[PDB]
Design a protein around this ligand. Structure first.
Ligand code: FES
Length: 98
C-alpha cells in the first residue's frame, strides 16, 4: 500500500501532499519528495521530529521518547513513523512537549 500523507505546518500556514509507502518512514519520504522537516537523532529517541495527528494512523513502534499519554494525544515521532492509513499530520510540534 502507498498512503497519502498531508503535512501541515501551522505556524507557516503551509500544506504539502506526499505519498508514503507502507514500509517507509514519513520523514524519509517527505525528504525524498523535496520537503525538509526537523530532525536530530533519527532514532525515535528525541522529540525534534515530533508531529501531531489530525487524522489517520501510524505505526511508530520503533519510537522510545513519547509516553503513552503523549501517544494517546496524537503525538508522533515522524522519523520512525510508518503510515498505516492516509494521514493528516501537523509538523514542527516539538515545542508542544518541552
Ligand atoms: S529525530 Fe529524534 S525522535 Fe525523530
Amino acid at each position: 500500500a502507498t498512503f497519502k500523507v498531508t503535512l501541515i505546518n501551522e505556524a507557516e500556514g503551509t500544506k504539502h501532499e506526499i505519498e508514503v509507502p507502507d514500509d517507509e518512514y514519513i520523514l524519509d519520504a517527505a525528504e525524498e519528495q523535496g520537503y525538509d522537516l526537523p530532525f536530530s537523532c533519527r532514532a525515535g529517541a528525541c522529540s525534534t521530529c515530533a508531529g501531531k495527528l489530525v487524522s489517520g494512523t501510524v505505526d511508530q513502534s520503533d519510537q522510545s521518547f513519547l509516553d503513552d499519554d503523549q501517544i494517546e494525544a496524537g503525538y508522533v515521532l515522524t522519523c520512525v513513523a510508518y503510515p498505516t492509513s492516509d494521514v493528516v499530520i501537523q509538523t514542527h510540534k516539538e515545542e508542544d512537549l518541552y
